[PDB]
Amino acid sequence: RSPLEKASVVSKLFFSWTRPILRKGYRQRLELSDIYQIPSVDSADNLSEKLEREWDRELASKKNPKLINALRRCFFWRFMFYGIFLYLGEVTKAVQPLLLGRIIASSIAIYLGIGLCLLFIVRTLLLHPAIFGLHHIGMQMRIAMFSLIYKKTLKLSSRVLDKISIGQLVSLLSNNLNKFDEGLALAHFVWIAPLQVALLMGLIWELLQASAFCGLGFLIVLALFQAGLGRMMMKYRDQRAGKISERLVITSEMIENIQSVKAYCWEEAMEKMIENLRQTELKLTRKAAYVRYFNSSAFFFSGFFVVFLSVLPYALIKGIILRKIFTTISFCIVLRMAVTRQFPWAVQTWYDSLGAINKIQDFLQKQEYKTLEYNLTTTEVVMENVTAFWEGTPVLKDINFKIERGQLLAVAGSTGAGKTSLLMVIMGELEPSEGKIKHSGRISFCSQFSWIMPGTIKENIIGVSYDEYRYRSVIKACQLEEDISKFAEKDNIVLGEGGITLSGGQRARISLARAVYKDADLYLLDSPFGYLDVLTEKEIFESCVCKLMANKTRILVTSKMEHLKKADKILILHEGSSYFYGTFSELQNLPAVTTWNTYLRYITVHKSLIFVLIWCLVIFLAEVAASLVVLWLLGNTSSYYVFYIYVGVADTLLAMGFFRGLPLVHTLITVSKILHHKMLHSVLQAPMSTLNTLKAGGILNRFSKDIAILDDLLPLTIFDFIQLLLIVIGAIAVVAVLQPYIFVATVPVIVAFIMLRAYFLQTSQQLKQLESEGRSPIFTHLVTSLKGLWTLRAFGRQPYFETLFHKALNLHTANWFLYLSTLRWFQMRIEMIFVIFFIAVTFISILTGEGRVGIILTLAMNIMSTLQWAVNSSIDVDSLMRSVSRVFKFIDMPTEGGGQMTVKDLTAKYTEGGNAILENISFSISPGQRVGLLGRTGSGKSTLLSAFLRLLNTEGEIQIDGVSWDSITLQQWRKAFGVIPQKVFIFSGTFRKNLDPYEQWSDQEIWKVADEVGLRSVIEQFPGKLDFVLVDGGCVLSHGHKQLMCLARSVLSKAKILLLDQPSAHLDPVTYQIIRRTLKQAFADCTVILCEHRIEAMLECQQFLVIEENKVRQYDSIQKLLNERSL
């Protein structure tokens, strides 16, 4: 099924293998089934077997067991030929300048023109094919390492897994998701660098043999300077981490508590708080990027200075002909790339791969979980002299209990008894320091929480065997069929992992049903009735817990007395000591939208953005005229060649000035700051209609990561694209005018540039989006499988678990290779366009003074590498700009817009015109009274409180305080009503700052109110006087203190209403008595509405406003409510 095998050799050289697949994808949409079959050798199981033998052999080789050698052992000569072949191609590109110098001496030279074109043709085929081949091994190496991690995680013991955090390996696993795969192409760079450096210097020495050391010294000095900036840059970025973490916590608090923030009527205060932290953080980023910007300019402004310095030492003895000058300049650019781009990057990248393998080898040693599979036995249980620790003394001592067959075993204990560890020790999942135990081969387990993977009931039931009769008989016996009464697809009801979209009680019953319906050599139930309550527990006890499991010899743990009554024995532990162990009678004995139009608006979002950008364009044509005029003057004593070298320096001719690149960096930095101010203000203005629509995780993730990318990563490469494009486009123009018809050739050549990029981007954008989309399933299965280790290890279904993961990695690999193969296909065809232009340039120039011909000839070889880097940068531009467009979409957020009061015809709905939560509600609010708004609680009364707050997708006519719901400002109306929060979100800061961020309260008004509110005595022990910073979201203050803080804030706000709800469910008796002394005086002249579910909690209300479904009733007193509203 793989088109690669059914392909011709020419398709491998011409990249025609992906030509048809990409062509078909250009018309139709990116179908998920369009992914071609993976290579037969690329099979996950086949690759895993080869690495498994080496890994076992590596450990068996010696005590040291260098796993890195084993990985190289099976994959060394596979790429060793590629490294040698690549080095031959790299040397060929260097030899080209020597041949180009022969033409400078001049007919017969036409023979050299074919060779110049031939050298590029041979190099083009070798380089592209080598790149595709080399990258393939990187995926193969990464696939085996990624798969091997799953095997290691499947054998670790609880003693090591619990001690080590999840981020030790799970986070490290995602670190190398694309590092080693993409970077595998730099393995042979170091080896090629030594030979190339000597060869390039040898050809340079063949010309003068005197100033050879001058060129190497300049490169070494620049390399040290370039490296030194990175050390400061990395440290500066590391220093910026502290400010980023502080801002992120505040942003999360605002995002999570958006509902409270809107009620707090202090959104502008929260906006100002984030502003102060962001300004200091932006100062570090602007300075750090400036250091990188100055360092990045080194390469673009190095060739002219280095070449001129080396040339002068040789020119001192005698001024050589221009042929030697051109040869050195061409070699210098190659030498500059070799000394800066083809060596400095390799050293850093090469050690990165070694470090990952060291970490992989580090995790190879860990506490392994021993297993005995299934040993034949008489199904007898035994336990005596058991001793172990929770990891300081033994949490158990002399646990003597043995059962021959069929004995009813039961478990019991206090809170935190730790019997699960003893049960794990009984099953072998916990290490016993002493004692012995005889148990049957297999055993059935039951966990407290079911970490069932995504799938239907039938999918979970069919784990080792599927039975039609059991699917009906067990479902009725386990009440699963009864729970299926709401299923439309019957047994085909599949949900996600974690049981998010399933009944909580039935999920545990259904999960235990698969183990209960399946036979086993032993049974070990733990918290089987964890969710069953009253009727469910009684039904299970009388029909499933004791009737269904009657025949099988089982040991269970439960708190039901009826279940214990059926048990023949019971063991009770009391703080590490078994208080009772025996019969029961013993105790009773005593998204991918590419809008080019929207790009201009984002680009033109700064005051000086237009002016700064236009400045470089104005200077762009300015330098071109001088270079053309200098050539038109000189070309149309000893220092004459200096002007030609300076003019011939393409990098220097288009080099950005000292006051050119820096201004763009400063201008680009302010763009993110302006966007952040607009985004923060707009986000707080989102109405509940749209605020509740967006997921909580989709806001911070689209704000924390997006803001950093647009600031740090974006401007660093954005300026490079403009800098590279200016030189590349400008250089061709000078040659175009010089040749008689190069403009005609460029006219047809420049048109082909759009066709290649646009067609490739059509599939590349979809492939990149599909590649990231499929990565989620790998992470989703990894976490889900890790949590359910104990349940899976009980049955030991490793082969089923291993098979469940081997196929998953293949799906990501198939999309990865297709996206990687297509990426090279566009790049491979790109070199063909340049070769044709280069051939046309040579032909016209040859048929055409030697300075003009020589300058044009030099620029021909000096545009190859620049064009390649230019095309690659333009592709990634859309990838980074994609996040900015999404932020702009978020920027278009929808706009949000005397106790006597009354309203009528108030109908409210949570959604826009959805089900009417309120149905023409009308009520009378007499001042100076307490009206309990209770009723049929338990169906959700938050909407009714929100209805009085007008925070729903509806509207009304609230004739409160002499004003209408629309006449007065919403912000002004927001200060009228006050509510008691259910879970207050106090700002992380000092008590004075957190409680009154607006700072409108005076110190006298603060100190006196604190004593008056009664919180001063409780908060007297705060650091200093009251400046104790409430770290970790106010964890220091209690729930009553938060209510007291809520009372303190409300008292200062002088709110006319006090919407209290769920008081008894959150307040302590001491706080309630304390509140009764204060709230009575605080609301003595206010109209509050105290709602609650408990009838006793509503007995304190003067009136009895009993809420009802879709029609809130009323009662003037308890007489009518207790007679009609209650029943």
Swiss-Prot record:
Effect of A794T: In CF; loss of bicarbonate transport; no effect on protein maturation, subcellular location at the plasma membrane, nor on chloride channel activity
GO cellular component: apical plasma membrane; cell surface; chloride channel complex; clathrin-coated endocytic vesicle membrane; cytoplasm; cytosol; early endosome; early endosome membrane
Membrane topology per record: Multi-pass membrane protein
Single GO BP term: cellular response to cAMP
Outcome after substituting D876H: In CF and CBAVD; decreases channel activity; no visible effect on protein maturation
SMART domains cross-referenced by the UniProt entry: AAA
Signal peptide: none
GO molecular function: 14-3-3 protein binding; ABC-type transporter activity; ATP binding; ATP hydrolysis activity; ATPase-coupled inorganic anion transmembrane transporter activity; ATPase-coupled transmembrane transporter activity; bicarbonate transmembrane transporter activity; chloride channel activity
Assembly description: Monomer; does not require oligomerization for channel activity. May form oligomers in the membrane. Interacts with SLC26A3, SLC26A6 and SHANK2. Interacts with NHERF1 and MYO6. Interacts (via C-terminus) with GOPC (via PDZ domain); this promotes CFTR internalization and thereby decreases channel activity. Interacts with SLC4A7 through NHERF1. Found in a complex with MYO5B and RAB11A. Interacts with ANO1. Interacts with SLC26A8. Interacts with AHCYL1; the interaction increases CFTR activity. Interacts with CSE1L.
Protein name, entry field: Cystic fibrosis transmembrane conductance regulator
Taxonomic lineage of the native organism: Eukaryota, Metazoa, Chordata, Craniata, Vertebrata
